[PDB]
Amino acid sequence: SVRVMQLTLGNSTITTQEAANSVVAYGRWPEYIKDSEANPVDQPTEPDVAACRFYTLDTVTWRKESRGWWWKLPDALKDMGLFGQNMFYHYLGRAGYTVHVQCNASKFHQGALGVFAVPEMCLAGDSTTHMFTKYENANPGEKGGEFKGSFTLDTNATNPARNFCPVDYLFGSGVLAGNAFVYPHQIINLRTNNCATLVLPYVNSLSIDSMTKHNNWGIAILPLAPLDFATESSTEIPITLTIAPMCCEFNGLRNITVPRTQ
Amino acid sequence: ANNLPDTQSSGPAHSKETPALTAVETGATNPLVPSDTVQTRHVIQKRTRSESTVESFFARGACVAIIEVDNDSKLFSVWKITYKDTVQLRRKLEFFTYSRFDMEFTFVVTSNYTDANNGHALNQVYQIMYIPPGAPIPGKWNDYTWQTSSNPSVFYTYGAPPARISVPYVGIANAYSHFYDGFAKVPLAGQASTEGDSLYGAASLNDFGSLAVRVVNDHNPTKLTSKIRVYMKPKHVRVWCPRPPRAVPYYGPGVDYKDGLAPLPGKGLTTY
Ligand SMILES: COc1ccc(OCc2ccc(COc3c(Cl)cccc3Cl)cc2)c(Cl)c1
């Protein structure tokens, strides 16, 4: 039925008994580069089962006060097994994804989470200096980031944070959040479903790019209807994020990249 | 101006054929492609060399002269036709030894009052007369030579779109020579040193003649100056014998050099 599914990729399987169908972004399933759209001339590496499998990133907790969370792809998976290895050993890389967000509660809980997949999800910074966010802050990895309820300008001139300041109702980029529904999405309304499943093809203005310099997709999760339970002002339910890269192919092998951190 | 070949997929090798090894002493360049030294994938090539054709490389109007006339002998000026008065077009032409093409000349004319608060003049008309080598050159801005009964003239009204005319291939040889390793005279044994001496690399003393420019209106005591910028574009181009481009500053009409003889910067041998 629309509600029961099983996803198998490599050596990993995911089962769900409360789905609300699955979304295939823009109606496009991920695919490899065709010869007619090929650019780099060298033989690509395609790890296949070693990289195209389900990786579970860290679990976040939803509370009445949560504003939202965000992650960047392939960034969030840079340290994930052999996918991360191939990402850093190659100059160029390409991949699609199957994003599976998990969140179960009970029949006496309420709340709705909007799960959006955004191509080129550029976020707003914290200073008066334009495009000032530094690489280390823009790429948090598997832990991702969070949305805020208001904009707060960083004034420390001696030691600028050079970080993002994504305000939730402004979708972290100066647009109204209610219009974010034009992007592939699903809603995890506690009275209806457990999860949200989105299949994302590779989207870019090029056939292949640098995975370290460029993040193709952004995953934004916003509480559309806040978490509430029985009468417990105190309520916490975890949100686990499991993502699997698809049709990975890398070009331009050399020595490994070791990016600067923190 | 066409397509480039596709990249064919290439796998591993273990053979007695070694395209990587060669011997440049022969004077030939090793025609290798990526698949000769690495494993390649099949790529359908869609890039073309449409913009690097000899025609597209020269298909631009380049400035070759700025003729100036002061409508208060300066009432008229004469410019000896050449492409060596400027450096940009000259350097591009000199990538080749010989050339053959037609020419398109566009004239951009500007004028202004020298005085911010003095004088006035009605709209000016200019006459650009071509004086082929041999024809009488004007001595005054208004002598008989300006009747142009045979010389081609162009009358330009100030403010009108730039004037433009086309000239056929006018060389007396089968192609224009960008380089001429010789003289126009051979000094003979016995003659005075003053005799038989000529410039090295020069052909005719007057190759293509010159342009005589003047303002046709009667000059008013007002101080005015006009400038005619000449733009030339080679069209229907054919070129022969490539040469390395000019690396140091030009020093005259010849290949002479003097000043910027150290064009390259310093860089460590093992510095990326
Ligand atoms: C190798 O590169 C070359 C070769 C020959 C060249 O000049 C030959 C040449 C001969 C006659 C005329 C005369 O053209 C004109 C006429 Cl009819 C009427 C009005 C104005 C002009 Cl302008 C103009 C140029 C140049 Cl500029 C570059």
Q: What is the 3-state secondary structure (H, E, C) of chain A?
A: CCCCEEEEECCEEEEECCCCCCEEHHHCCCCCCCCCCCCCCECCECCHHHCCCCEECCCEEECCCCCCEEEEECHHHCCCHHHHHHHHHEEEEEEEEEEEEECCCCCCEEEEEEEEEEECCCCCECCCCCCCCCHHHHCCHHHCEECECCCCCCCCCCCCCCCECCEHHHCCCCCCHHHHHHCCEEEEECCCCCEEEEEECCCCCCCCECCCCCCCEEEEEEEEEEEEECCCCCCCEEEEEEEEEEEEEEEEECCCCCCCCC
In our burial notation (b when 16+ CB lie closer than 10 A, e otherwise), range A222-244 reads bbeeebebeeeeebebebebbbb
- Structure-determination approach: cryo-EM
Which positions in chain B touch A39 (Cβ < 8 Å)?
A: 43
Closest among A27, A68, A33, A26 to A171, alpha carbons compared: A68
A65 touches chain B (CB under 8 A): no
Handedness of CA A3, A6, A7, A12 (dihedral sign): positive
Task: Compute CA distances B179 → A203, B169, B183, B211, whole Å.
Answer: 55, 18, 12, 24
Distance from CA of B30 to the nearest CA of A (A): 19
Eight-class DSSP state of B210: E
CB of B224 shorter than 6 A to ligand 1: no
Considering CB atoms only, which of B7, B9, B44 is closest to A36? B44
What six digits make up the tokens of B178?
A: 């960008």
β-pairing verdict for A109-119 and A185-189: antiparallel
Asked, for residue A262, whether it belongs to a domain, the answer is: no
Say if residues A94 and A256 touch (Cβ distance below 8 Å): no
Q: How many interface pairs between A and B have CB atoms less than 8 angstroms apart?
A: 31
In a domain, A196, yes or no: yes
Residue B60 one-letter amino acid: R
Round to whole Å and give the CA distance between A248 and A244. Answer: 10
Residue nearest to atom 20 of ligand 1 (CA): B130
Which two structure tokens, joined as six digits, stand for A9? 């990729």
Contact A90, A78 (CB under 8 A): no
Check which CATH number belongs to the domain holding A22 and give it.
2.60.120.20
Sign, CA dihedral A245-A18-A191-A229, equals negative
**B81 C-alpha to center of ligand 1: Å?**
6
β-bridge partners, B77 = B213
* Domain annotation covers residue A102: yes
Q: How far is CA B188 from the centre of its chain?
A: 35
| Cα–Cα dist A175/A168, whole Å | 10
Measured CA to CA, the distance from residue A141 to residue A78 in angstroms comes to 7
CB contact at 8 A, A160 and A129: yes
Q: Token match 């913009």: residue? A: B51
Q: By the CB < 8 Å criterion, does A31 face chain B? A: no
* Strand pairing category for B163-167 and B153-157: unpaired
Please tell me the distance from the alpha carbon of residue B240 to that of residue B98, in angstroms, as a whole number: 5
Is the residue at A195 inside a domain? yes
Distance CA B146, CA B160 (A): 22
Residue A258 maps to a domain: no
Q: Does a structural domain hold residue A105?
A: yes
Cβ of B41 within 8 Å of Cβ of A36? The answer is no
Question: Best of B33, B42, B43 to disrupt the A interface by mutation (most A CBs within 10 Å)?
Answer: B43
Q: Are A139 and A214 in contact (CB under 8 A)?
A: no
Distance from the alpha carbon of residue B225 to the mean position of ligand 1, in angstroms? 25
- Which of B44, B4, B42 shows the shortest CA–CA distance to A44? B42
Which positions ≥6 away from B15 have C-beta within 8 Å? none
Tokens read off for B54: 């000899």
In a domain, A214, yes or no: yes
Strand A145-146 with A69-73, pairing: antiparallel
CB contact under 8 A, B44 and A44: no
**Range(s) of the domain holding residue A70:** 5-253
For residue B209, what are the CA distances in angstroms to B78, B86, B129? Answer: 10, 18, 11
Q: How many domains are there within chain A?
A: 1
Which atom of ligand 1 is the closest one to the Cα of B83?
26
- Residue A260 within a domain: no
